[PDB]
Design a protein around this ligand. Sequence first.
Ligand SMILES: CC[C@H](CO)Nc1nc(OCc2ccccc2)c2ncn(C(C)C)c2n1
Length: 307
Amino acid sequence: RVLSIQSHVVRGYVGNRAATFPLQVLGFEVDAVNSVQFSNHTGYSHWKGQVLNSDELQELYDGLKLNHVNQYDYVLTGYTRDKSFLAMVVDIVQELKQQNPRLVYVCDPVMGDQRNGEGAMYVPDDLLPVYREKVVPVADIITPNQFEAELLTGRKIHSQEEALEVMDMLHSMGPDTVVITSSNLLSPRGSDYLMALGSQRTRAPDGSVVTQRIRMEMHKVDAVFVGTGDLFAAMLLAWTHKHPNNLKVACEKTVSAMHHVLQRTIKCAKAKSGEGVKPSPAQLELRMVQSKKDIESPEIVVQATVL
Ligand SMILES: CC[C@H](CO)Nc1nc(OCc2ccccc2)c2ncn(C(C)C)c2n1
């Protein structure tokens, strides 16, 4: 079903460790290529491990070709630091497109994050061109930051309408689906929340247009989590699966599950930390296992609005 090219960590949930349980517990046949194998994410004090290069990635895809098992339903990628690695990935995703007409490519274009004023990049700046020029033109679903969206389109978002028009710039780039997973925009409910935007432009009979758009708002949480976005794109794959043309119906359940997972995480997290000290990166690790049930059967405790 899915060819997930992401990272692996012995401990915690980031990358492939954040996307495989779900996609699996949902019932997707997940094939995983670990871009790196680190002992834990780089937010802990120390960390060690190895990274995979372009040839090594090449090697594994090769293996899959020779056994004629290189046929995929979906392809999911995320955080990378090697421009070459990212490049190599585009080639692969192409061919895989020739075997199965359209195995949707779900791409989380991880580049950095925003705080009210501007942003802080995670990756070196040279990756920017590749995502903009080579990557995005082939992705079929993308889940960027506001920062990330701004970096791709080159346009800075100051309001909601400005936002919808930057998504369009994205659509015409290729992705018939765009979902700004978070933003600095205040929302119709106070800074007590987080706003995310969603828009899919479904070609159709011969009017040649249709474009849907909604706006979910999740109850912000008082903590710093690593991996939330990998968990996001994973489930978005699950759900937008059952409801191809229902950009609304998906996020709705996708976002739903995260509030669950997160608060149980936060809850537990605290439970562990005394009541006058910040939980460490260690205790903040997504209680993935324990959301065994939530992830599969969501309480649609969120709702949005078309436009
Ligand atoms: C870069 C920002 C965070 C530090 O808080 N570290 C981190 N660390 C990771 O560990 C894997 C890695 C380590 C070194 C180079 C490339 C990937 C991550 N894998 C996925 N992700 C996110 C995009 C969710 C990873 N994030």
